[PDB]
Amino acid sequence: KNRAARVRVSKGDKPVTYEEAHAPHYIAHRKGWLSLHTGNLDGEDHAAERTVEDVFLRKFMWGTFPGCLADQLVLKRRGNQLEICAVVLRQLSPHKYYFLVGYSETLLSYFYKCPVRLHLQTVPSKVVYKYL
């Protein structure tokens, strides 16, 4: 039986998001990609470097906004601009979200030597697609 990236059926009490509810074979069919860049196009270079950067930013944001992320990050690269789009919860005070945005954008801009912007969308609670 296939296991990869499959949230398994339970008793009907486990809330899953839309991202979680779709196995890998639905990628490009029902669900899109969580990062968009040119490295994996034919004739393009530096796919390995974009992949390492993406893995770091996901770990970095998980621990920089601990308990606040309500879904996976969406990573967008245009030119040398890096856009991080995150769906977060509404528990932390707005002052802390502004501190962490200023801190994260600045720290990541100096780390990867590119202008980095963080876009936060807040939701009252994790959006539930279905109960498995």
């Binding site: 890998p24 990628i27 899109g32 990609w33 969580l34 994996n40 390995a48 974009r50 992949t51 996901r58």
Partner: protein
Amino acid sequence: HYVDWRMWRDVKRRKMAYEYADERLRINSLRKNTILPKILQDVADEEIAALPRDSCPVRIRNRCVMTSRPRGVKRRWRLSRIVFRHLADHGQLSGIQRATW
């Protein structure tokens, strides 16, 4: 802070191979022709053999950069099949999807 001691040895091999690349390239040029005297090429053979063993680029191994797996690595992403699939199967590799045809 590298994944293991085996990745750390390969890191050092890549650094030393980079430092000796020009010297080895120049000495090899003397050995890779039929123009120069054998007396001169025999000395160049000994000179390149006397360089540090880990300066030799054939000892560099393409290991998985996140797990240090020495085989099953995809060169384009520098990841092992297991690590690559984990990212691909979660939709985190731009443009990569399951193939059906």
